[PDB]
Amino acid sequence: ETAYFSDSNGQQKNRIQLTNKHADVKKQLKMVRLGDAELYVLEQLQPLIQENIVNIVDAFYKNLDHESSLMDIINDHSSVDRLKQTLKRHIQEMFAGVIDDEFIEKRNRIASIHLRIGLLPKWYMGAFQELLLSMIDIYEASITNQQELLKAIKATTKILNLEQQLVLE
Amino acid sequence: QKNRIQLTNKHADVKKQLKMVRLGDAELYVLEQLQPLIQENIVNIVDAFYKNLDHESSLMDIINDHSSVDRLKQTLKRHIQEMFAGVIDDEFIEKRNRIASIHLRIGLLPKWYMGAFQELLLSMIDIYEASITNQQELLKAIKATTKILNLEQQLVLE
Ligand code: HEM
Ligand code: HEM
Ligand SMILES: [C-]#N
Ligand SMILES: [C-]#N
């Protein structure tokens, strides 16, 4: 049969570039078992994710109007239409297959931003779940090997958990 | 699935929170359905949890300052099993809250708290892959499990 993933170990090295500024982050990646192999997997999903980001962002803002105050927050500072563009690029930065200082530093920046505008952490956390769900949905439609499917899901739960760790608290 | 979510107006936001992770009756029924699977591997799930913590010396230090891994696996076994009870009520929420506050008083960092939930998920996804053949039921169980663990992080972060 055909496979979705390449297993090219030549291809999956050096995907963690962290200095001592980010000395805890290397521990954190080790605990969620985020490594070269998982990052290479992330990198190969990026096309799927890219091809589907518009559905992923639409679904995300749609979910948020379950809580009117989250929408007030958005409309006080911006608009959905304009947050989508930046969410597209953030989501896609998750599937780049490299964790480095800049990656971290950008995550700390968006954290501070949500802190400022008053997002409460439980809505922040809840919001990552529509992402997960839309991704799983994209995987299933496109990855019909059951074993490769699980592999895409596990990698994804890993990168999302690191995302949540970065923004908290 | 019956009437598995039984919250009073003091937990108004939690209701919204549930709707937003799509944790309703169907998903709770699924978790209930998974409970026997989960109970039959709880010892190993919890062995793996603490094993994984040992990679961060400061986490085990907090644990040994306050308690111990042997006493801690008894409450964790029970906590995880209650996760698949298939019912969310005021007391379920209320315990998660008290358990949270213990962790802030002991000085557990929320990054670490957060990573810790991934470990459980992984052990859980491992069991379902070994145990549930049909791909759709398999996705259904991971999705459910994923919802409840997200709730659990929300309530801790409250
Ligand atoms: C997984 C969840 C989320 C991610 C990854 C995320 C990410 C981002 C990013 C990358 C930006 C930067 C935009 C810029 O450059 O100005 C941003 C902006 C913003 N986000 Fe989020 N966001 C998330 C959830 C939320 C939620 C739940 C709300 C709703 C309250 C929210 C409200 C905002 C607002 C209002 C801004 C700033 C607008 C401005 O002043 O320009 N975010 N978010
Ligand atoms: C998925 C994450 C976690 C869950 C679900 C969890 C759950 C629990 C539960 C149910 C209790 C007992 C509360 C009670 O007495 O009612 C407990 C105890 C405790 N947990 Fe956690 N825990 C988690 C992560 C952690 C981590 C990562 C650490 C530190 C390495 C930690 C340290 C402790 C300690 C030291 C206590 C209190 C012992 C005492 O004061 O006697 N927990 N946890
Ligand atoms: C933040 N969109
Ligand atoms: C908390 N083990």
Curated annotation (Swiss-Prot), chain A:
It comes from the Bacteria. Heme-containing signal transducer responsible for aerotaxis, the migratory response toward or away from oxygen. Belongs to the methyl-accepting chemotaxis (MCP) protein family. Homotetramer. This is Heme-based aerotactic transducer HemAT. The lineage of its organism: Bacteria, Bacillati, Bacillota, Bacilli, Bacillales. The gene is hemAT. The chain holds residues 10 to 178 of 432 of the full protein.
